[PDB]
Amino acid sequence: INQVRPKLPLLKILHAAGAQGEMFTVKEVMHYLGQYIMVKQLYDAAAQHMVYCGGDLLGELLGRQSFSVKDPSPLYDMLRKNLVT
Protein backbone atom coordinates (compact mmCIF):
# COMPACT_ATOMS: atom_id res chain seq x y z
CA ILE A 1 0.00 0.00 0.00
CA ASN A 2 1.34 3.47 -0.84
CA GLN A 3 1.73 6.27 1.73
CA VAL A 4 0.63 9.74 0.56
CA ARG A 5 1.12 13.30 1.84
CA PRO A 6 -2.00 15.44 1.36
CA LYS A 7 -1.38 18.96 0.14
CA LEU A 8 -1.96 21.84 2.47
CA PRO A 9 -5.53 22.56 1.24
CA LEU A 10 -6.48 18.92 1.98
CA LEU A 11 -4.29 18.60 5.12
CA LYS A 12 -6.41 21.53 6.42
CA ILE A 13 -9.65 19.49 5.94
CA LEU A 14 -7.99 16.31 7.21
CA HIS A 15 -6.77 17.86 10.50
CA ALA A 16 -10.19 19.55 11.00
CA ALA A 17 -11.93 16.16 10.80
CA GLY A 18 -9.65 14.85 13.63
CA ALA A 19 -6.41 13.73 11.96
CA GLN A 20 -2.80 14.79 12.62
CA GLY A 21 0.03 13.46 10.52
CA GLU A 22 1.36 14.18 7.09
CA MET A 23 1.67 10.59 5.83
CA PHE A 24 -1.62 8.73 5.28
CA THR A 25 -3.18 5.93 3.22
CA VAL A 26 -5.94 6.67 0.65
CA LYS A 27 -8.31 4.60 2.84
CA GLU A 28 -7.56 6.94 5.80
CA VAL A 29 -8.06 10.11 3.69
CA MET A 30 -11.39 8.71 2.52
CA HIS A 31 -12.39 7.98 6.18
CA TYR A 32 -11.47 11.51 7.34
CA LEU A 33 -13.19 13.03 4.33
CA GLY A 34 -16.53 11.53 5.47
CA GLN A 35 -15.79 12.52 9.07
CA TYR A 36 -15.43 16.13 7.83
CA ILE A 37 -18.77 15.91 5.98
CA MET A 38 -20.47 14.82 9.26
CA VAL A 39 -18.81 17.42 11.54
CA LYS A 40 -19.61 20.33 9.10
CA GLN A 41 -23.07 18.76 8.46
CA LEU A 42 -22.62 19.26 4.67
CA TYR A 43 -25.33 16.76 3.73
CA ASP A 44 -29.08 17.17 3.06
CA ALA A 45 -30.79 15.69 6.19
CA ALA A 46 -33.82 14.78 3.95
CA ALA A 47 -31.40 13.07 1.47
CA GLN A 48 -28.24 12.04 3.53
CA HIS A 49 -26.31 10.93 0.35
CA MET A 50 -26.34 14.38 -1.31
CA VAL A 51 -23.37 16.35 0.13
CA TYR A 52 -23.79 20.13 -0.25
CA CYS A 53 -20.17 21.36 -0.57
CA GLY A 54 -20.44 24.84 -2.08
CA GLY A 55 -19.81 27.44 0.63
CA ASP A 56 -17.02 25.19 1.93
CA LEU A 57 -13.39 24.62 0.85
CA LEU A 58 -14.27 20.99 -0.08
CA GLY A 59 -16.46 22.48 -2.86
CA GLU A 60 -13.63 24.79 -4.11
CA LEU A 61 -11.29 21.74 -4.03
CA LEU A 62 -13.84 19.55 -5.88
CA GLY A 63 -15.37 22.27 -8.14
CA ARG A 64 -18.81 20.87 -7.26
CA GLN A 65 -21.76 22.72 -5.76
CA SER A 66 -23.05 19.37 -4.42
CA PHE A 67 -22.59 15.64 -5.10
CA SER A 68 -23.92 12.22 -3.97
CA VAL A 69 -21.89 9.47 -2.25
CA LYS A 70 -23.49 7.02 -4.82
CA ASP A 71 -20.68 8.24 -7.10
CA PRO A 72 -17.57 9.42 -5.25
CA SER A 73 -15.41 9.65 -8.46
CA PRO A 74 -15.17 13.42 -7.88
CA LEU A 75 -13.44 12.68 -4.55
CA TYR A 76 -10.99 10.31 -6.35
CA ASP A 77 -10.32 12.91 -9.08
CA MET A 78 -9.50 15.52 -6.38
CA LEU A 79 -7.24 13.13 -4.39
CA ARG A 80 -5.19 12.56 -7.57
CA LYS A 81 -4.54 16.36 -7.63
CA ASN A 82 -4.03 16.77 -3.85
CA LEU A 83 -1.91 13.79 -2.63
CA VAL A 84 1.79 13.29 -3.31
CA THR A 85 2.87 9.66 -4.03
PDB file of all heavy atoms in Angstrom, residues 43-56:
ATOM      1  N   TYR A  43     -24.413  17.641   4.478  1.00  0.00           N
ATOM      2  CA  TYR A  43     -25.330  16.763   3.730  1.00  0.00           C
ATOM      3  C   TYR A  43     -26.748  17.286   3.917  1.00  0.00           C
ATOM      4  O   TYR A  43     -27.019  17.991   4.903  1.00  0.00           O
ATOM      5  CB  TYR A  43     -25.203  15.311   4.174  1.00  0.00           C
ATOM      6  CG  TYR A  43     -25.326  15.127   5.656  1.00  0.00           C
ATOM      7  CD1 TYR A  43     -26.554  15.042   6.278  1.00  0.00           C
ATOM      8  CD2 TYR A  43     -24.201  15.053   6.439  1.00  0.00           C
ATOM      9  CE1 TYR A  43     -26.679  14.898   7.640  1.00  0.00           C
ATOM     10  CE2 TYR A  43     -24.298  14.886   7.806  1.00  0.00           C
ATOM     11  CZ  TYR A  43     -25.539  14.800   8.394  1.00  0.00           C
ATOM     12  OH  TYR A  43     -25.644  14.678   9.730  1.00  0.00           O
ATOM     13  N   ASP A  44     -27.614  16.965   2.963  1.00  0.00           N
ATOM     14  CA  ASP A  44     -29.081  17.174   3.056  1.00  0.00           C
ATOM     15  C   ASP A  44     -29.584  16.214   4.139  1.00  0.00           C
ATOM     16  O   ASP A  44     -29.212  15.074   4.075  1.00  0.00           O
ATOM     17  CB  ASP A  44     -29.713  16.896   1.689  1.00  0.00           C
ATOM     18  CG  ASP A  44     -31.117  17.424   1.505  1.00  0.00           C
ATOM     19  OD1 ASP A  44     -31.667  17.910   2.479  1.00  0.00           O
ATOM     20  OD2 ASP A  44     -31.629  17.344   0.370  1.00  0.00           O
ATOM     21  N   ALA A  45     -30.358  16.625   5.127  1.00  0.00           N
ATOM     22  CA  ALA A  45     -30.793  15.691   6.193  1.00  0.00           C
ATOM     23  C   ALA A  45     -32.087  14.969   5.766  1.00  0.00           C
ATOM     24  O   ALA A  45     -32.566  14.117   6.498  1.00  0.00           O
ATOM     25  CB  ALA A  45     -30.936  16.452   7.476  1.00  0.00           C
ATOM     26  N   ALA A  46     -32.628  15.342   4.607  1.00  0.00           N
ATOM     27  CA  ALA A  46     -33.825  14.779   3.953  1.00  0.00           C
ATOM     28  C   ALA A  46     -33.379  14.072   2.672  1.00  0.00           C
ATOM     29  O   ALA A  46     -34.239  13.807   1.831  1.00  0.00           O
ATOM     30  CB  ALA A  46     -34.778  15.908   3.649  1.00  0.00           C
ATOM     31  N   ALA A  47     -32.077  13.799   2.560  1.00  0.00           N
ATOM     32  CA  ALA A  47     -31.400  13.071   1.467  1.00  0.00           C
ATOM     33  C   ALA A  47     -29.924  12.899   1.875  1.00  0.00           C
ATOM     34  O   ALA A  47     -29.061  13.400   1.131  1.00  0.00           O
ATOM     35  CB  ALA A  47     -31.563  13.791   0.139  1.00  0.00           C
ATOM     36  N   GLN A  48     -29.629  12.177   2.968  1.00  0.00           N
ATOM     37  CA  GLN A  48     -28.243  12.041   3.529  1.00  0.00           C
ATOM     38  C   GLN A  48     -27.337  11.190   2.630  1.00  0.00           C
ATOM     39  O   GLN A  48     -26.926  10.116   3.052  1.00  0.00           O
ATOM     40  CB  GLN A  48     -28.224  11.377   4.900  1.00  0.00           C
ATOM     41  CG  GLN A  48     -29.410  11.677   5.773  1.00  0.00           C
ATOM     42  CD  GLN A  48     -29.090  11.159   7.149  1.00  0.00           C
ATOM     43  OE1 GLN A  48     -27.939  10.915   7.483  1.00  0.00           O
ATOM     44  NE2 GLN A  48     -30.107  10.918   7.948  1.00  0.00           N
ATOM     45  N   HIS A  49     -27.043  11.656   1.427  1.00  0.00           N
ATOM     46  CA  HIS A  49     -26.310  10.930   0.351  1.00  0.00           C
ATOM     47  C   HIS A  49     -25.993  11.975  -0.697  1.00  0.00           C
ATOM     48  O   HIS A  49     -25.244  11.684  -1.584  1.00  0.00           O
ATOM     49  CB  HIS A  49     -27.094   9.743  -0.257  1.00  0.00           C
ATOM     50  CG  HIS A  49     -28.132  10.145  -1.257  1.00  0.00           C
ATOM     51  ND1 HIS A  49     -27.859  10.294  -2.606  1.00  0.00           N
ATOM     52  CD2 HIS A  49     -29.459  10.399  -1.126  1.00  0.00           C
ATOM     53  CE1 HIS A  49     -28.956  10.642  -3.254  1.00  0.00           C
ATOM     54  NE2 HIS A  49     -29.958  10.728  -2.365  1.00  0.00           N
ATOM     55  N   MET A  50     -26.582  13.152  -0.524  1.00  0.00           N
ATOM     56  CA  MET A  50     -26.342  14.379  -1.308  1.00  0.00           C
ATOM     57  C   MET A  50     -25.546  15.320  -0.400  1.00  0.00           C
ATOM     58  O   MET A  50     -26.114  15.843   0.576  1.00  0.00           O
ATOM     59  CB  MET A  50     -27.691  15.000  -1.675  1.00  0.00           C
ATOM     60  CG  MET A  50     -28.383  14.275  -2.781  1.00  0.00           C
ATOM     61  SD  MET A  50     -27.351  14.314  -4.258  1.00  0.00           S
ATOM     62  CE  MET A  50     -27.106  16.066  -4.535  1.00  0.00           C
ATOM     63  N   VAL A  51     -24.253  15.460  -0.654  1.00  0.00           N
ATOM     64  CA  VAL A  51     -23.370  16.351   0.132  1.00  0.00           C
ATOM     65  C   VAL A  51     -23.417  17.737  -0.496  1.00  0.00           C
ATOM     66  O   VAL A  51     -23.150  17.866  -1.681  1.00  0.00           O
ATOM     67  CB  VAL A  51     -21.940  15.807   0.118  1.00  0.00           C
ATOM     68  CG1 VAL A  51     -21.033  16.723   0.914  1.00  0.00           C
ATOM     69  CG2 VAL A  51     -21.900  14.376   0.629  1.00  0.00           C
ATOM     70  N   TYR A  52     -23.724  18.752   0.280  1.00  0.00           N
ATOM     71  CA  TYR A  52     -23.789  20.131  -0.251  1.00  0.00           C
ATOM     72  C   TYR A  52     -22.489  20.831   0.114  1.00  0.00           C
ATOM     73  O   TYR A  52     -22.366  21.292   1.236  1.00  0.00           O
ATOM     74  CB  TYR A  52     -25.094  20.788   0.204  1.00  0.00           C
ATOM     75  CG  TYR A  52     -26.253  20.313  -0.628  1.00  0.00           C
ATOM     76  CD1 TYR A  52     -27.178  19.410  -0.149  1.00  0.00           C
ATOM     77  CD2 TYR A  52     -26.359  20.694  -1.946  1.00  0.00           C
ATOM     78  CE1 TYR A  52     -28.207  18.940  -0.946  1.00  0.00           C
ATOM     79  CE2 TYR A  52     -27.363  20.209  -2.768  1.00  0.00           C
ATOM     80  CZ  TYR A  52     -28.304  19.330  -2.268  1.00  0.00           C
ATOM     81  OH  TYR A  52     -29.326  18.888  -3.061  1.00  0.00           O
ATOM     82  N   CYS A  53     -21.531  20.827  -0.803  1.00  0.00           N
ATOM     83  CA  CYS A  53     -20.167  21.360  -0.568  1.00  0.00           C
ATOM     84  C   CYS A  53     -19.942  22.548  -1.492  1.00  0.00           C
ATOM     85  O   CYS A  53     -19.459  22.336  -2.589  1.00  0.00           O
ATOM     86  CB  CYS A  53     -19.142  20.282  -0.861  1.00  0.00           C
ATOM     87  SG  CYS A  53     -19.165  19.770  -2.599  1.00  0.00           S
ATOM     88  N   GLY A  54     -20.401  23.723  -1.126  1.00  0.00           N
ATOM     89  CA  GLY A  54     -20.444  24.839  -2.082  1.00  0.00           C
ATOM     90  C   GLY A  54     -19.889  26.100  -1.463  1.00  0.00           C
ATOM     91  O   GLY A  54     -19.118  26.851  -2.162  1.00  0.00           O
ATOM     92  N   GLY A  55     -20.262  26.310  -0.200  1.00  0.00           N
ATOM     93  CA  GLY A  55     -19.812  27.441   0.627  1.00  0.00           C
ATOM     94  C   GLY A  55     -18.749  26.990   1.588  1.00  0.00           C
ATOM     95  O   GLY A  55     -18.687  27.548   2.722  1.00  0.00           O
ATOM     96  N   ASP A  56     -17.991  25.988   1.135  1.00  0.00           N
ATOM     97  CA  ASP A  56     -17.019  25.194   1.927  1.00  0.00           C
ATOM     98  C   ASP A  56     -15.823  24.935   1.028  1.00  0.00           C
ATOM     99  O   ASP A  56     -16.007  24.894  -0.174  1.00  0.00           O
ATOM    100  CB  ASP A  56     -17.571  23.848   2.401  1.00  0.00           C
ATOM    101  CG  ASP A  56     -16.979  23.402   3.725  1.00  0.00           C
ATOM    102  OD1 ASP A  56     -17.540  23.786   4.771  1.00  0.00           O
ATOM    103  OD2 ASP A  56     -15.943  22.724   3.705  1.00  0.00           O
TER     104      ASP A  56
END
